[PDB]
Amino acid sequence: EKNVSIVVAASVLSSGIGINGQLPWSISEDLKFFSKITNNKCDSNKKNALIMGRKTWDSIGRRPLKNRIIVVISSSLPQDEADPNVVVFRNLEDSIENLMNDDSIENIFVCGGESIYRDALKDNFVDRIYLTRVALEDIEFDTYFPEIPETFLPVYMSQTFCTKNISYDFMIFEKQEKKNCDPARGQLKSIDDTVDLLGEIFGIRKMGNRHKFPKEEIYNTPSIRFGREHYEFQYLDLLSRVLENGAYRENRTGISTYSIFGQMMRFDMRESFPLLTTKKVAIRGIFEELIWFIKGDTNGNHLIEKKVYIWSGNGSKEYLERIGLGHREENDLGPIYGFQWRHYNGEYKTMHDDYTGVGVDQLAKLIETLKNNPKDRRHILTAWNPSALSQMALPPCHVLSQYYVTNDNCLSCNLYQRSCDLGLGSPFNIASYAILTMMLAQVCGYEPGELAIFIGDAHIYENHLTQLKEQLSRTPRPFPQLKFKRKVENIEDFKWEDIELIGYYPYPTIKMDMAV
Amino acid sequence: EKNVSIVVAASVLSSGIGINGQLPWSISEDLKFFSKITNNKCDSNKKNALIMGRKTWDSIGRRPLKNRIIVVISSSLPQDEADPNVVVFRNLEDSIENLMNDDSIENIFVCGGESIYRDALKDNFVDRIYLTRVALEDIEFDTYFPEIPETFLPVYMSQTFCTKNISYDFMIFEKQEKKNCDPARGQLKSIDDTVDLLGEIFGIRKMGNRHKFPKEEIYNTPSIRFGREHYEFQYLDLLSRVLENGAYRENRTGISTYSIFGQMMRFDMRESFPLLTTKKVAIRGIFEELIWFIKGDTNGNHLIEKKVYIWSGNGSKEYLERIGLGHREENDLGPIYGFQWRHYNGEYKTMHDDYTGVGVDQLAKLIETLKNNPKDRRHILTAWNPSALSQMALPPCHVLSQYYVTNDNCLSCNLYQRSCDLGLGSPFNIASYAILTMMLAQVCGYEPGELAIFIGDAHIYENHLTQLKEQLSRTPRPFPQLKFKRKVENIEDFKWEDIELIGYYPYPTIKMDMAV
Ligand SMILES: NC(=O)C1=CN([C@@H]2O[C@H](COP(=O)(O)OP(=O)(O)OC[C@H]3O[C@@H](n4cnc5c(N)ncnc54)[C@H](OP(=O)(O)O)[C@@H]3O)[C@@H](O)[C@H]2O)C=CC1
Ligand SMILES: NC(=O)C1=CN([C@@H]2O[C@H](COP(=O)(O)OP(=O)(O)OC[C@H]3O[C@@H](n4cnc5c(N)ncnc54)[C@H](OP(=O)(O)O)[C@@H]3O)[C@@H](O)[C@H]2O)C=CC1
Ligand SMILES: C#CCN(Cc1ccc2[nH]c(N)nc(=O)c2c1)c1ccc(C(=O)N[C@@H](CCC(=O)O)C(=O)O)cc1
Numbered sequence A, B: 001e002k003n004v005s006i007v008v009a010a011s012v013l014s015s016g017i018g019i020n021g022q023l024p025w026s027i028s029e030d031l032k033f034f035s036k037i038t039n040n041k042c043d044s045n046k047k048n049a050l051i052m053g054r055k056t057w058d059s060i061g062r063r064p065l066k067n068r069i070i071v072v073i074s075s076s077l078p079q080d081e082a083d084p085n086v087v088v089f090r091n092l093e094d095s096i097e098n099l100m101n102d103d104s105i106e107n108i109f110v111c112g113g114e115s116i117y118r119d120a121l122k123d124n125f126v127d128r129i130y131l132t133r134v135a136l137e138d139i140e141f142d143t144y145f146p147e148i149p150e151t152f153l154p155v156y157m158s159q160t161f162c163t164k165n166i167s168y169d170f171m172i173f174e175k176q177e178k179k180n181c182d183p184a185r186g187q188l189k190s191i192d193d194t195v196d197l198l199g200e201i202f203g204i205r206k207m208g209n210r211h212k213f214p215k216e217e218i219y220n221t222p223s224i225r226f227g228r229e230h231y232e233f234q235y236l237d238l239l240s241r242v243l244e245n246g247a248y249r250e251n252r253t254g255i256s257t258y259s260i261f262g263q264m265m266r267f268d269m270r271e272s273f274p275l276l277t278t279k280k281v282a283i284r285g286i287f288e289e290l291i292w293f294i295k296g297d298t299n300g301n302h303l304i305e306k307k308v309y310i311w312s313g314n315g316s317k318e319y320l321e322r323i324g325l326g327h328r329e330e331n332d333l334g335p336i337y338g339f340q341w342r343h344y345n346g347e348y349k350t351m352h353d354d355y356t357g358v359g360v361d362q363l364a365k366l367i368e369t370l371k372n373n374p375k376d377r378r379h380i381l382t383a384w385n386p387s388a389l390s391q392m393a394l395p396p397c398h399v400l401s402q403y404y405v406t407n408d409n410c411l412s413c414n415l416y417q418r419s420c421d422l423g424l425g426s427p428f429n430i431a432s433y434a435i436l437t438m439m440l441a442q443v444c445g446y447e448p449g450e451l452a453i454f455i456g457d458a459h460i461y462e463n464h465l466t467q468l469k470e471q472l473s474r475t476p477r478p479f480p481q482l483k484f485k486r487k488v489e490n491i492e493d494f495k496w497e498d499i500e501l502i503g504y505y506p507y508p509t510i511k512m513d514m515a516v
């Protein structure tokens, strides 16, 4: 029948595609994509046609595109014979007669101009859309990509890439007419039927039935079945798995959860920063807690003083009293994360004491082994100290991490987290250890690698159900970028002002109460 | 023309299906499977036909099967019109006219007798094979399932199930005809080509390019693309993953490996024991090293005396020397795990010293919490004590573990393993911590749950390449069962003889040298 597909690069929030007759931006990988995509064909004796409005024709210098035939739509341009790789038409519908004839034309692409896009869509001429989402807002646009008609559904979203600090995506939308998101399903009737029957026979007894694929009403952007490349699906899909399989269970806080044991999440950090886009995340507070950790600081007031209250709850007199630490000052949390990082096995007295020299400095050693022996398999940082647990406001959650220097020269990080509050703590942990890995990488002379998080008790607190369903209804946007303004000499030296968060265009923040 | 599939239950090694006119076993779930499968149909106005040899007809008492038509092949049986649900034919070929006609007959099943299977396969009448593999050998068989023709390929392998301590699967075989083993690829031209093109543009900058799908020549039983349910694939595919992506890198050993970071494996422990069948695995030494840890013993002699030599290489006078620990008696391994399990943070001297009372007894604490506070999110056991690494013959590989009591009353286990020798240590760790979980579960009144292994440095030593590729050429068999003959009072009371390993029919041992 001959496929007709739109190909465009529009800004993530406004769908801005042009300014004063030009592109709002310069991203070569995107042009390479345009070239590969429009050039891609089966028959060597055929060519693809690239339809475009006249202004776009002007915008590219009125020079032909190799191996392809350009079809310009113009009421004024003359139909001449000079170039046989460029041809003119008076309206879109007529040019569409690439279909009813030229058998030398394999595929058709609508290659843009807002005016051309809008018609092709209005008149139901396109089957597919290749959308390069560019994280560039707050800049002038005078040309837009129309809003994608509801008859289209996304089927692929690649990971975030980066060019000159600009984050971008690649999505594919397909028009689906007439008529499970599980990839290993709907593949072969006999396999699906057999597994289904085996499941009826055994019950909880078949491990698969303990790991049911999420029903679509809890599956984010469910139409994307085989192309969920964007690594934010790694967190959304874990949410879906616990919403689908979570056992309902009581716990120390009195606010029950839905709980599954033993999931994982991997995020790339070479091209982008894993800061969730489906909800606005408080990154300043994350950074402050991280730096607070690095300095082996356990004084909660230092956090509060900077208007960061994540540790207030577990620092209160009331709480400290409840767990048997009524002897502490307000906000003395005991030998937690920071202390175990800088002074492992050190004898904790109070937050006011000087501990320089005491305990084992894991962090310092980590940076030394990382520099001097990179391929060593012992780059570990731990916070689990059986002898210190009872003195901690809260036992270590992000419990152990290990660090792996690539042959590429990048720093990758693994973290086991015994207990993970998916709504409120996970987004934090992900970003936090993404930042730490980048800080470690800079002081050791490496580039950021990959981040993998392995979870024990992965749960959602029962008062976050409607909030996370809300979140799950939001399709993800390209991840932002995070850059350091200066190269520090000591990891303890980083400051908020040193952090540059580039291109973060999240959805509204979603309120969620933390369980004390 | 419609579908003809075989349904058979045969023993793992010899494919025995009968003895003295009956089955060698009684596994009701398999009868339930047989029933689901041969009853399975779309058109509510048609029925399926089950073809069987006369002897099989005798073996089921000559009583019709509900909702189905039974086709008996016999030279002697009278062709009566009496029961419209049972029909007789003089030969298998004539019977196949179920195709040509009886549009009441939706699908056809060859339901067996060795004589009937062997004919159906020889004359090319069957398209599919449903094959329940039973782990029973060393019992009498007089009837067998023919050897599956090479024109058939395996497309599914369920997990191992257990009935009356008998391990069993089911798997599907499909007949091949003309025509990527990757699940997500091959679903849409548009998506595969986009991902491909994107890969070309970005190269190593696209995470996916850093985790390529393994090429078939190194992927176990590649024809099974969407049905690799047998949890032995969790191990085998990790092997395949590093063969395909592993980075060549040197290490302290002197024997270079191939390395990838952050991987995971999952194993069920409810229906079976995860002891690799693609190679014979030494379970006894494993158990002996395990019970050794449990007791807190750091004395390497005790294992040698029991003829277990896994800790010799790293306990010799020459080795303890190269790492500056010669002031130590030979085979005095220092406070590794065991000491860390029973006396975490205790002050270590020699192995002969009496440590009762020193250090934190994590194991004891574990068991007392698993009992009194199952839902607790802190069941942790750690062996990574920075304050003690210097004096350990070797730093801890299986570094931390977490334990999770389901509402189902089972005990699941998570282990982070900083470094993992895939050819030598991994098969051991999977079994080791499987056993430890069953021990803990018996002792605490629970049933075995699931086992997940999170790995940091996942590698293969370069001298194991031939052995591993050999292993990768062996198709998995059902896992064996592992039961305790008695209920111990304390976990320190387990003894080799208390363990009954039922139904293990591994492939031959594969010799692999351990890098010191
Ligand atoms: N990021 C991206 O993906 C892309 C962005 N762009 C940007 O978009 C902008 C150009 O888009 P836009 O401003 O909409 O201009 P267009 O490229 O749509 O071209 C408009 C011209 O096309 C002809 N035309 C349009 N409709 C008709 C019709 N119904 N009948 C006959 N001729 C018609 C007219 O030419 P005439 O006056 O001769 O009749 C009109 O002047 C530029 O800034 C460009 O940089 C362009 C392509 C891609
Ligand atoms: N594990 C499993 O899935 C199954 C196992 N079994 C076991 O298999 C055994 C039975 O198999 P088997 O011993 O091979 O006997 P079969 O069940 O295959 O039946 C053999 C009979 O079928 C008829 N027959 C066979 N070939 C022909 C032919 N070419 N022309 C005409 N009639 C033919 C003959 O009946 P006649 O004498 O009337 O000519 C022959 O005696 C039993 O022990 C049963 O328990 C059976 C089914 C399934
Ligand atoms: C992990 C971690 C760090 N931590 C430490 C921390 C301490 C105790 C915890 N307790 C529980 N039950 N869950 C947690 O995630 C948790 C986290 C956090 C603590 C609180 C919040 C939280 O309340 N966040 C709110 C705050 C709003 C804001 O940041 O301005 C949020 O909206 O996100 C986040 C992180």
Ligand SMILES: C#CCN(Cc1ccc2[nH]c(N)nc(=O)c2c1)c1ccc(C(=O)N[C@@H](CCC(=O)O)C(=O)O)cc1
Binding pocket: B253, B282, B285, B310, B311, B314, B421, B424, B425, B426, B428, B429, B510, B511, B512, B513, B514, B515, B516
């Ligand atoms: C994990 C662990 C325990 N350990 C501890 C241990 C210590 C140092 C190591 N060093 C290296 N490089 N790899 C290891 O797996 C390793 C394992 C083991 C050590 C050796 C064998 C081993 O060589 N087994 C032989 C033969 C012994 C047998 O047949 O029983 C084998 O061929 O399988 C297994 C486990």
Ligand SMILES: CN(Cc1cnc2nc(N)nc(N)c2n1)c1ccc(C(=O)N[C@@H](CCC(=O)O)C(=O)O)cc1
Binding pocket: A007, A008, A009, A023, A030, A031, A032, A033, A034, A035, A052, A056, A060, A065, A110, A111, A112, A132
């Ligand atoms: C019409 N237009 C505007 C433009 C710019 N970027 C886009 N990007 C996308 N994703 N989609 C578009 N339609 C698109 N259009 C174009 C078209 C072609 C070239 C161009 O130079 N193309 C060469 C570029 C090749 C290269 O640089 O590697 C080609 O090979 O097709 C530039 C702008």
Ligand SMILES: CN(Cc1cnc2nc(N)nc(N)c2n1)c1ccc(C(=O)N[C@@H](CCC(=O)O)C(=O)O)cc1
Binding pocket: B007, B008, B009, B023, B030, B031, B032, B033, B034, B035, B052, B056, B060, B065, B110, B111, B112, B130, B131, B132
């Ligand atoms: C021919 N035969 C021997 C037998 C036994 N086990 C097998 N198992 C398998 N997987 N495949 C076979 N062909 C097979 N055949 C049979 C056939 C039917 C029944 C039988 O009782 N079937 C009932 C069983 C119903 C039930 O137990 O739930 C049915 O509904 O089909 C027993 C033995």
Ligand SMILES: O=c1ccn([C@H]2C[C@H](O)[C@@H](COP(=O)(O)O)O2)c(=O)[nH]1
Binding pocket: A251, A252, A394, A395, A397, A398, A419, A420, A421, A422, A424, A425, A426, A429, B377, B378
């Ligand atoms: O870095 C952190 C700190 C705490 N929590 C959450 C996990 C649990 O919801 C709660 C800890 O409670 P316990 O598992 O100790 O009961 O705080 C996190 O998710 N990440």
Ligand SMILES: O=c1ccn([C@H]2C[C@H](O)[C@@H](COP(=O)(O)O)O2)c(=O)[nH]1
Binding pocket: A376, A377, A378, B251, B252, B394, B395, B397, B398, B419, B420, B421, B422, B424, B425, B426, B429
């Ligand atoms: O349970 C274990 C014990 C040791 N090893 C292997 C992993 C490495 O091959 C080697 C440890 O080397 P280092 O991490 O110390 O470099 O021992 C395992 O795989 N599993």
